C-alpha cells in the first residue's frame, strides 16, 4: 500500500476579515504515465481571474510494472500549420 | 490498496467578510495512462473569469501491469491545416 | 481496493458576505486510458464566465492489465483542411 | 472494489449575500477508455456564460482487462474539407 | 509501503484580520513517469490573479519496475508552424 494523503479540514472557530484561509488542499498528485498541458487554463474558487496560454508542443509518457517488454512508441509532431485567434474586448 | 485521499470538510463556526475559505479541494489526481489538454479551459465556483487558449499539439500515453508486451503505438501529427477564429465583443 | 476520495461537506454555521466558500470539490480524478480536450470549454456554478478555445491536435491513449498483448494502435492526424468562425457581438 | 467518491451536502445554517457556496461537486471522474472533446461547450448552474470553440482534431482510446489480445485499431483523420460559420449578433 | 503525506488541519481557535493562514497544503507530489507543462496556467483559492504563458517545447518521460526491457521511445518535435494570438482588454 502506498500514495496516501491526509485530510485538511477547517477546524473549530469563527472566521471574518479579508482573504483568510484555514485547512484546504490544491495541486497535482499521484498521476502515473499521463500528460497534462499543451495549452490549458485551470481556475477554481477564485475572484476575477484572467489567463492567456499559447503552445506549439509534443508530449510522450509511459509507466510499466512487468510491462513495456519488447515494445515501441513512435511520435512525429505537428508540421506546416497556420492559426489566428482574435481579441477579447 | 493505494491512492487514497482524505476529506476536507468545512467544520464548525460562522463565516462572514470578503474572499475567505475553510476546507475544500481542487486539482488533478490519480489519473493512469490518460491525456488532458491540447486547447482546454476549466472554470468552477468563480466570479467573472476570463480565459483564452490556442494550441498546435500532439499527445501520446500508456500504462501497463503485465501489459503492453510485444506491441506498438504509432502517431503522425497534424499537417498543412488553416484556421481563423473571430472576436468576442 | 484503491482510488478513494473523501467527502467535502459544508458543516455547521451561518454564511454571509461576498465570494466566500466552505467545503466543496472540483477537478479531474481517477480516469483510465481516456482523452479530454482538443477544443473544449467547461464552466459550472459561476457568474459571467467568458471563454475562447482553438485547437489543431492529435491525442492517443491506452490502459492494460493483462491486456494489449501482441497488438497495435495506428493514427494519422488531420491534413489539408480550411475553417472560418465569425464574431460574437 | 474501487473508485469511490464521498457526498458533498450543504449542511446546517442560513445563507445570504453575493456569490457564496457551501458543499457541491463539479468535474470529470472515473471514465474508462472514452473520448471527450473535439469541439464542445458545457455550462451548468451559471449566470450569463459566453463560450466559443473551434477544432480540427483526431482522438483514439482503449481499455482492456484480459482484453485487446492480438487485435488492431486503425484511424485516418479528416482531409480536404471546407467550412464557414457566420456571426451571432 | 511508501510515499505518505500527513494532514494539515486548521486547528482550534478564532481567525480575523487580513491575509492570514493556518494549516493547508499546496504543490506537486508523488508523480511517476508523467509530464506537466508546455503552456499551462493553474490558479486556486485566489483574489484577482493575472497570468501569461508562451511555449515552444518537447517533453519525454518513463518509469519501469521490471519494465522497459529491450524497448524504444522515439520523438520528433514541432517543425515549421505559424501562430498569432490577439489582445485581452
Residue numbers in the entry:
A (entry chain C), B (entry chain B), C (entry chain U), D (entry chain A), E (entry chain D): 272 to 360
Give sentences from the paper.
TAR DNA-binding protein 43 (TDP-43) is a ubiquitously expressed RNA-binding protein with diverse roles in RNA processing. The carboxy-terminal part comprises an intrinsically disordered low-complexity domain (LCD), which contains regions enriched in glycine, hydrophobic residues, and glutamine and asparagine (Q/N). The abnormal assembly of TAR DNA-binding protein 43 (TDP-43) in neuronal and glial cells characterizes nearly all cases of amyotrophic lateral sclerosis (ALS) and around half of cases of frontotemporal lobar degeneration (FTLD). Here we report the cryo-electron microscopy structures of assembled TDP-43 from the brains of three individuals with the most common type of FTLD-TDP, type A. TDP-43 formed amyloid filaments with a new fold that was the same across individuals, indicating that this fold may characterize type A FTLD-TDP.
The fold consists of five connected layers formed by R272–Q360 in the LCD. The first two layers are formed by the glycine-rich region (G274–G310), the hydrophobic region (M311–S342) contributes the third and fourth layers, and the Q/N-rich region (Q343–Q360) forms the fifth layer. The fold is centred around a kinked, 11-residue β-strand formed by A321–Q331 in the fourth layer, which forms steric zippers with β-strands in the neighbouring third and fifth layers and imparts an arrangement that resembles a three-bar chevron badge. Owing to this resemblance, we hereafter refer to the fold as the chevron fold. In addition to hydrogen bonding within intermolecular β-sheets, the filaments are stabilized by hydrogen bonding ladders formed by glutamine and asparagine side chains and by staggered stacking interactions between aromatic residues. The third, R293, is located in an unusual buried position inside a compact loop linking the first and second layers. The overall effect of this buried charge is expected to be destabilizing. We proposed the hypothesis that the burial of this residue may have been facilitated by the post-translational modification citrullination (deimination), in which the charged guanidinium group of arginine is hydrolysed, yielding a neutral ureido group. Analysis of filaments from the brains of the individuals with type A FTLD-TDP by mass spectrometry established the presence of TDP-43 molecules that were citrullinated at R293.
